[PDB]
């Protein structure tokens, strides 16, 4: 569980 790319 990856973070969000716009972050």
């Amino acid at each position: 569980d990856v973070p969000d790319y716009a972050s």
Epitope: D1, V2, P3, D4, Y5, A6, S7
Partner: antibody
């Protein structure tokens, strides 16, 4: 076919609570993050929350920070948003939209919208 | 936050003619690593949710018609429709999709010359 159908929108007293649901289909729900994106009556579009694919990361605008919470159920294919302490500025069409974790190409998949009205 | 700006608000068009819409972020939407701008253009016709038209500023999505092209980098972006047809009278939004908070412009809304 990716299907994201929302439910829950209603008339709410300001300073109340409401909990919407977004039920996704035609994809593996858990590999993608999601967002709630709302539309006001002046057709102003704004982002509300993002939750990553395993619910371990959540993101909020200051408007909504500490008043709403995005959460998911990966087993039941359902995404949620608990609104609390509802002001009248939050009356809007609430859309669930997928975050495109693989393509990184914007909000490709949107739902139908559900409408909240916060009015005394 | 990266505030987005769209000009014009309305645009009067004649069908068959080229029309240009501009978008402006307050901060460069340029992803140095991936080497692309993370700016998306949306089209919403009434009743519908928005629709993805161009992403990565210039990459036209699948099934979107040829007449639509995205241009610009850094802070200035431009959408072109080159034979505006009658089914383009919609509202067009640009979106910062580089840094959360994600921000949407106000829209430019096409109306027809008469």
């Amino acid at each position: 076919e990716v299907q994201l159908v929302e439910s829950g929108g209603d008339l709410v007293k300001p300073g109340g609570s409401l909990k919407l649901s977004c039920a996704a289909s035609g994809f593996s729900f858990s590999s993608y993050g999601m967002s709630w994106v709302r539309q006001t009556p002046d057709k102003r579009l704004e982002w509300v929350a993002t939750i990553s694919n395993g619910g371990g990361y959540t993101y909020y605008p200051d408007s909504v920070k500490g008043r709403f919470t995005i959460s998911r159920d990966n087993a039941k294919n359902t995404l949620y948003l608990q609104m609390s302490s509802l002001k009248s500025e939050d009356s809007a069409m609430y859309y669930c939209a997928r975050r495109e974790r693989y393509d990184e190409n914007g909000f490709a998949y949107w739902g139908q919208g559900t409408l909240v009205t916060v009015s005394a | 936050d990266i505030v987005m700006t769209q000009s014009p608000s309305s645009l009067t068009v004649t069908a068959g003619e080229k029309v240009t819409m501009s978008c402006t972020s307050s901060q460069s939407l340029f992803n140095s690593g991936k080497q692309k701008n993370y700016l998306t253009w949306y089209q919403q016709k009434p009743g519908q949710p928005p629709k993805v038209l161009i992403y990565w500023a210039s990459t036209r999505e699948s099934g979107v018609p040829d007449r639509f092209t995205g241009s610009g980098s850094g802070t200035d972006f431009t959408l072109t429709i080159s034979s505006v047809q009658a089914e383009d009278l919609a509202v067009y939004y640009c979106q910062n999709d580089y840094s959360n908070p994600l921000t949407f412009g106000g829209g430019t809304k096409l109306e027809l010359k008469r």
